[model samples]
Target: NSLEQFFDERVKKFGLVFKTSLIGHPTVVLCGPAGNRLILSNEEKLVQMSWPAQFMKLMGENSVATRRGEDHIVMRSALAGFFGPGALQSYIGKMNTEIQSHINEKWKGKDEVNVLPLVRELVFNISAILFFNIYDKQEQDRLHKLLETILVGSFALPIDLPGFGFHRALQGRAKLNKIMLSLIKKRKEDLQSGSATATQDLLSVLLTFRDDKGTPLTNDEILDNFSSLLHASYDTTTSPMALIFKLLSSNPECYQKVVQEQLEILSNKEEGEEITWKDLKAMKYTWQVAQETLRMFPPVFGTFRKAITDIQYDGYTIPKGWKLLWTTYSTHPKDLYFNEPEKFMPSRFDQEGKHVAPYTFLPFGGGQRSCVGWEFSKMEILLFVHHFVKTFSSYTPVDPDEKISGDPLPPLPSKGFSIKLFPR
Candidate 1:
């Protein structure tokens, strides 16, 4: 998704501005901090989140990315509580229980398996449970396979007739819609009956949420938000979690140090005791590893923003309706922000008040449009590290690593990045 680096070297050699085709539209790929800050900071003022029209179709029109202005703010606020720090305060124990069971069922005692795929299962299962209170194994399995199709098709070229890429993705989402709506239906009844589960979890919060007008969100809105949130929740988390472990496995020095830091929490916990907020907060050094991993490999390397009107950037004109793609921190940080450039060092995030420069740390985007799941992602990744290090002594990649590539998302590997685990 980011040719910016390759084009970057050539951009400096040629000009700060470059033109190309992205997602089937004429795109202006801008270079340097001046361009990025203006688009990222004044998200509502100058530009709006303008992904491809096809993406809008794929992600439902009501999703945060597809809507604009007041609509965007409204949607973001409605779902904020589920992803924010406050939710993590009480949800860590429950999430870790799922993670542990997930490990035992999926990863424990495996001779060999692909990590990224297992993580996909691990993350999706957790997302369904936490976000929607989906506890039925059959439903979880159905959603997982159907979504496996949806995700693969999401990046596929948009051809929506029967048996086409967009068709299958839509088909998958459509199937999930039935499942989503039914769950929403039952949850609504449960909310009234007082027989519902997990009062403070995401679904509970959504069911009970009301806006400034004190009006509750509609059932359709609930379904849209749940499906979109379920999709967003795990895709980004899984890849980064896999990368964090992969990086640790690749570097013995870092791996040993990271495990020791992890041992501080897990060793003290009695068997099956939960990883809580205090424990997560204490794993600063391990968290830095995730920070460093994301710096190199963000979830979506380039986010599309469209100019509302004719815009001036670096003395150049960006015409209205022209899509502007801002490259993320992918390879750019190595050239500048980080010292030792290309090396893998988790300590970079430990320097304190780092990423003071805006738009520099962008695994999550910036401004009002930034990922709402920042806290959830951190909690997911850190708690995963704790549980993983506790359960396994080490893991070995099944094959040599390949260069990372994703047509629609970032950090999806060329292969599956599988590994064999050694239990303690």
Candidate 2:
């Protein structure tokens, strides 16, 4: 089915729990409050994380997604601090600089524009800079170009025959591995030589990070994480940012309200000063809009898990060893949790309201196995919207009523999703 029809069809055909076949697997998908609690209560006990062979091959077998138990603890703990909430306070200036510079250079002069491609680099480059410390101008440029080729086959078919996309991804990964390992080795040597003190950037932290057992991460662990983090911090952000831009342009009233809120925030900052933590926390309305946008168009639909133990739900028996999936769209727009489920209402998340039902709004997902990068991504999204909304007071989309389409990971617009930016 087309991405357009797949989501719409399910909107009218939901059950207590949805049962369906998807992506070459016979699956039992969860839904509603009871079903959600059954999984999030103690996620690890009954289920083991699972993904396609293509993922294992592309992201490395030991990558965080495929690991479980002590291994998951080790990997998750190693990288948690770098992207966690309080950790990114210092990075606000870095992110603000990136967002502002990119817009002025790439977006300021254009009459008719497509913000998707521009925002993609803005997000990716910010990740590259903050995560890896790719500060040198030439090195940043090289990494930028390499990423274009490297990401081309990232989600392509798993075929690895000669002259294929997956093969190219593998080749690109090899090249990327060489670049990363060289930097990793240099950072390790610097830490040993006393010439460089460890900092919070991920590379420096990983070089010195040790697990609870006091064991350092192996080179393979670091390499796999390096590859996976690029995907997490960059690709995970690109699609959602695109959605926000399109959503704002598609709805002028909402756009005006959002712009008004952002402009108030911007009025307080200095001419060249960066947005502070106070600024982000203060944009209440803008944040609500973001939440609503996520509920409507969840870029990362859900995680796939394999049942390791029998699960009894309601009256049905979900036997052990069956592949399982739980998706946000299945429950996000449900009439049970949201008032006007099919409508777009940012005020649903307003503070004055009854509050979004617990476990019902999980764009970044819930439980321990959930994304560690959630806060960082949200901060980036909100910060970008703050600056973007204040800068572009009004804009019109090439197709305001254009249809949307997507995969399990990223959702795109019907015609590359363009808009004409109008600054105040």
Candidate 3:
């Protein structure tokens, strides 16, 4: 009865059944207007198939994210040490510096500027420093272009025909790998020569990491982990920024709330004062707004998971190999979850009304394999917004007809949304 109900609801609203053949496996298409109950109730049963592996194969083979279960955990753990709680304090200053510098550089001598490209560069810079200890301006410029090529190509065309998007992505991945490997080799040599000092970058920590048996990570493992971290940090950070600006531009009331919050926080400080981790934590309203923004516009719209074992729900049996799809973005619009599902209301996330059903608002995902960089990503976002709203009075959308687009995946601005940032 439950399975039939689920199928019937999905078909009614989405005009499609819970079919496996369309996307290569059985999926629960949680986009049905009924609610996200099918996904929220059966959270564990759903698998997150779109990760290192799927992303890797989508671009090219041999990507670290493609590895499954144990291997994925092993590599992910080593990388986690760098992005984890203990290691994020060092990145706060760097993220602030990069964000401010880019904003100033791009906004100077221009009344109208698009914040998307600038935010892209800022996120890339932060990822470079935190992951690879890369600070060279010239090198970062080159890598930025490469990362764009790789990401664009990966999504261009799924087929691996020569000279196609997939082929270009493969080439970009190879180039990126070469660069990472080169850095790994250099770091290893520096450590061996006793020329390296205690560093906060992930590469430095990963190089010296030893397992219980005193076995250090191999060069290949280091390279793979580095690549995975880059991908994880890059796009995840960029997408939300675009969405945040879009929301602010569209909703003046929300924009004023964010601005007032930032002004109160900066009132006691002098100009050019850097926002510390403590300052970021103190801005509770900003964090709530960011969380609300995530709920409405999750960067990763959908996450896929495979059935490790045959599991039954209601009356249907989901056999092994069936993939479950969780539509995070669509779920946010369900009236069952929020008071005004379609409205951009950050106040919904006020402390008093924060309680919501589990899996009903999973932007960062759920379960054991949820995003490892959750805290880091959130902090980075809050800090970015704090500085952005303080420096710029407002942002207005460049194109009115630029409807939100991207299906079966995170929604991206179809026209690559641009905003005009104004000085306060």
Residue-wise lDDT of candidate 1 within 1-424, one digit each (tens)?
4442232234455464777777677778775566677778877777778866666666677776677998778778767766667755777777888888888888787878777877887788888778776778887888888877777766677888897877888888888788778877888788788878545567788777787888877776776666667667767887787777666766678888878988877678898676778888888888888887887777766688887878787777888877887776433465565676567888777755364355566667778888888887788788777777888898887665655665546566667777778999
Error of model 2, residue 93, in angstroms: 1.3
- What CA RMSD would candidate 1 show? 2.7
Alpha-carbon TM-score of each model against the true structure: 0.91, 0.91, 0.85
**All-Cα superposition RMSD per candidate:** 2.7, 2.6, 4.8
Which residue pairs clash in candidate 1? 114-418, 115-418
- Candidate 3 residue runs with Cα over 4 Å from true position: 1-9, 13-17, 28-54, 58-64, 270-273, 395-402, 407-410
What residue pairs clash in candidate 3, if any at all?
Answer: 20-25, 47-304, 47-305, 48-304, 48-305, 49-304, 52-65, 52-66, 53-65, 53-66
Computed on alpha carbons, the lDDT of every model, listed in order, comes to: 0.74, 0.75, 0.67
TM-score of 3: 0.85
lDDT of 3 by residue, 332-414 (tens): 76777776777888787677335766556777765555677888888778878876777777667778567665432445566
> Clashes per prediction?
2, 0, 10
Poorest stretch of ten by lDDT in candidate 2: 3-12
